[PDB]
């Protein structure tokens, strides 16, 4: 049907926008602290702490799977990366401080991105 393809063309180019956003979010993580899931081999008790782990690699797989149906779902995943980190790691750790910076520096990018989405519908 002509309805699903035009729709697809939106879901597909929502995807296109969010990939752009994601690459900008990740550049705010130069040390690549959030690039990959926390190693369960290196932190075996991790899941006893964090019930919904998240990282940039995992977001990217969902992104390419066209798994984000809107910007809200995407931001939820971004938030998980930051909030997990600020619970698991103490305040005076390179980890915690890295999540604070990412959250602060990320906010303007998400600010823009929210304005583009409602714009192009
Ligand atoms: C995301 C997070 O909280 N990290 C702290 C633990 N480190 S680790 C296993 O020591 O390299 C990975 C990043």
Curated annotation (Swiss-Prot):
Organs and tissues of expression: Highly expressed in testis.
Superkingdom per UniProt: Eukaryota
Intracellular or extracellular location(s): Nucleus; Chromosome
Covalent cross-link Glycyl lysine isopeptide (Lys-Gly) (interchain with G-Cter in SUMO2), where: 41
Domain Bromo residues, every copy: 9-113
Task of the protein: Scaffold subunit of various histone acetyltransferase (HAT) complexes, such as the MOZ/MORF and HBO1 complexes, that acts as a regulator of hematopoiesis. Plays a key role in HBO1 complex by directing KAT7/HBO1 specificity towards histone H3 'Lys-14' acetylation (H3K14ac), thereby promoting erythroid differentiation.
Description of how the protein assembles with itself and partners: Component of some HBO1 complex composed of KAT7/HBO1, MEAF6, ING4 and BRD1/BRPF2. Component of the MOZ/MORF complex composed at least of ING5, KAT6A, KAT6B, MEAF6 and one of BRPF1, BRD1/BRPF2 and BRPF3. Interacts (via PHD-type zinc finger domain) with unmodified histone H3. Interacts (via PWWP domain) with dimethylated and trimethylated 'Lys-79' on histone H3.
Name this polypeptide is given: Bromodomain-containing protein 1
Organism expressing this protein natively: Homo sapiens (Human)
Origin organism lineage: Eukaryota, Metazoa, Chordata, Craniata, Vertebrata
Gene it is expressed from: BRD1
Complete-protein stretch covered: 555 to 674 of 1058
